[PDB]
Amino acid sequence: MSGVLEGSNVKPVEAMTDMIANARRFEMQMKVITSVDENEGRANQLLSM
Amino acid sequence: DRLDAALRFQQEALNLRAQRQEILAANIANADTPGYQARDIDFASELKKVMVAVDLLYRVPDQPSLDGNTVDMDRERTQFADNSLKYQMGLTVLGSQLKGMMNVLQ
Numbered sequence: 434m435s436g437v438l439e440g441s442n443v444k445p446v447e448a449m450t451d452m453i454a455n456a457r458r459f460e461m462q463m464k465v466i467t468s469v470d471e472n473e474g475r476a477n478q479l480l481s482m
Numbered sequence: 483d484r485l486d487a488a489l490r491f492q493q494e495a496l497n498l499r500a501q502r503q504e505i506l507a508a509n510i511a512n513a514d515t516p517g518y519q520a521r522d523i524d525f526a527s528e529l530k531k532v533m534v535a536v537d538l539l540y541r542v543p544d545q546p547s548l549d550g551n552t553v554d555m556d557r558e559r560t561q562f563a564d565n566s567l568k569y570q571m572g573l574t575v576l577g578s579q580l581k582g583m584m585n586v587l588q
Contacts, residue, residue, distance in 0.1 A: 473555075480559050482566055 485583075492576040494532050498525060499569040501536060506562045509553045516549035520558070 505521055512518050520541035528536065543552040 476556065476559075480562060482563070 489576065489579070491533065492572060492579065495529060496569065496572045496576065498523075498529055498532065499565060499572055503562075503565050503569060505538065506558060506565060509558060510562070513553050513555065514551070516551055518551050518553055520553035522561075 502523055502525060505523065509518075509520050509522075520543070521538045522541050523536065523538050541552070541554075541558075544554055544557070
C-alpha cells in the first residue's frame, strides 16, 4: 500500500532488560577476577623458603 | 675408591635433586608459554639407573586449557618446595657423614 512508511522494530523493554543483565553479569565476573587474583597472589608466598 | 662410592650414593642423590630443581624452575619460568608441555623426571627410578643420559616424562594434565598450556601451578609449586627440602636434607646428611669421617683423623 502507498502513502505509509514503515519504521524500525526495537523493543525498549528487551533493550532495558538486556542492559541490566549485562551490567550485573559484568559485575559478577569482575568479582570473580578479583577473588582469583587475590588467591593466586597469596598462594605464591608458599613458593618462598 | 671405597670412599668414592660411599659418598657417591649421596652425591648422585644430590645431583639428581639439582637436576629436578632445574626442570621445575624451567617449567615455572615457562608457565605462561602457549603450546608448552610440563616436564618432570622419576627420582627413584632415575637414581636406581644411575647407581646401577637423563630421560624426562610429561606430567599428566589436570585441567584443560585452550592455549595448549598444561603446566599447572599449585602441584608444581608443592613439588618445588618438597624438592628444595629434600635437597637440603641430602646436603646436611652428606655434610654430617663427611664431618664424621674427618673428625676420626684428629
